[PDB]
Amino acid sequence: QGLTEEQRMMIRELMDAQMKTFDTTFSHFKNFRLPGVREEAAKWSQVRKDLCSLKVSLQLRGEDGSVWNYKPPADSGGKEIFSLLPHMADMSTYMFKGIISFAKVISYFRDLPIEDQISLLKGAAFELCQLRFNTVFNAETGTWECGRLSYCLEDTAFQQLLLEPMLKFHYMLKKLQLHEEEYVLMQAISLFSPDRPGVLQHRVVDQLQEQFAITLKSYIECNRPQPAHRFLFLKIMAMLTELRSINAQHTQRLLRIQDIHPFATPLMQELFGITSSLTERHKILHRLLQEGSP
């Protein structure tokens, strides 16, 4: 609507890919692990800080309407706070696999060298994942409604859980009331990022990113009430900007946790480089980027 043919082509494409690679009902998230029915001490305190603010109740509904509801333990002194980590790992892996499929379906990403595909996916995995989660995030009740599953945030007395940049990011992104096109456009911008460490076709990625950014700007310009939504692009850009911080700090945090308590799936180990050449360093990722064998 009101865009050039190439822009609307990009939007239609992104929408198609999102549609084909994002199971919002999570009906195919199966066989996931469930929570069972000196410097060491300082870093341990660190990891504890990391987990204390990110506690969620795990609601699970059944075929017949039966609902099993998990609540995490209050912090003590050991493993009792590392109870959801396997499940979180499985969820993360499912989402990541979805993101990789998403990147594959897009033509531009598919025309890039495999090494650049690896680099871009490495740099944008967690970001895209977070965006998609914001798509099913319920700001009203503070819950991620993943079809059968639901991740509700645990109370403390709200204003003090916004001192975690991730939750604040989800609330502030959900307040923006974005269309699907805008979400998938953000995904496109963060995905095609030239600043990512091991990219070779920096030129093409840059051109593409600028094109997507302009497409987004123009979409806000044409498909929303004129002065009600003029600073929307600014807010979205701020979001894409904080997304970086979130990504870095999530990486280092996950590192700190894995360091004293291994839990992360091989795919996660690859996406965050946990132990070269790009293809041997990411055999799983690299394998997922080639088709098929169905």
Binding site: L163, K168, M172, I189, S190, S193, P194, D195, P197, H202, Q209, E210, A213, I214, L216, K217, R230, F231, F233, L234, M237, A238, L240, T241, E242, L243, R244, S245, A248
Partner: protein, 227 residues
Amino acid sequence: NEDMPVERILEAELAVEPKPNDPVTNICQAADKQLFTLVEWAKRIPHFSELPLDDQVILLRAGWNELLIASFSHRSIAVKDGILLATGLHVHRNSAHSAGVGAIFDRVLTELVSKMRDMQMDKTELGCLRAIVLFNPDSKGLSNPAEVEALREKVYASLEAYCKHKYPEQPGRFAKLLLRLPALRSIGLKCLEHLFFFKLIGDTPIDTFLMEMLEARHKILHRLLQE
């Protein structure tokens, strides 16, 4: 519009410049030298001073790295290859990689210096971008982020009008300008990782103001704003 006058930001930019001996030391001294200048530049931006003092402190502590980075990245346009410090010092590739900061160096060149160069970014645009970076409502401890936000989007509006007026042949120049913010952020974080690592060792003669910025009263910054 004219409430956040773009020309005032431009002269705010113009008032603060007209221009391996342990290259790490050199960068630290350059930064320290440019932190006071950063305070003055900040005070020269409209409405920044009529904010709560502690909010000013917060914004500066949150943005100083990105601001300085944008500054010297835009300074390095004139030179062909390398990065020109504010101390008239020209840091090159070889020593940067020899200093263990080669990757972030190259990333700064490609994402910022190169892009700013090709895009022919002027200084009022740079000043507007840096102003936007400065007015970050999502900073921690803000007594009120609403005003900060209003200011940010005033700079936004002024900049968009500026790009409409000045570059009618480039319909998507504004979005392209804003598109630098995420890249700048990653570069900023990645520079902080370094500064902390270099400080952790104590190998480099860091200076007072930089140390104050790297630590989390504080003294200095709270002073330079009373004037």
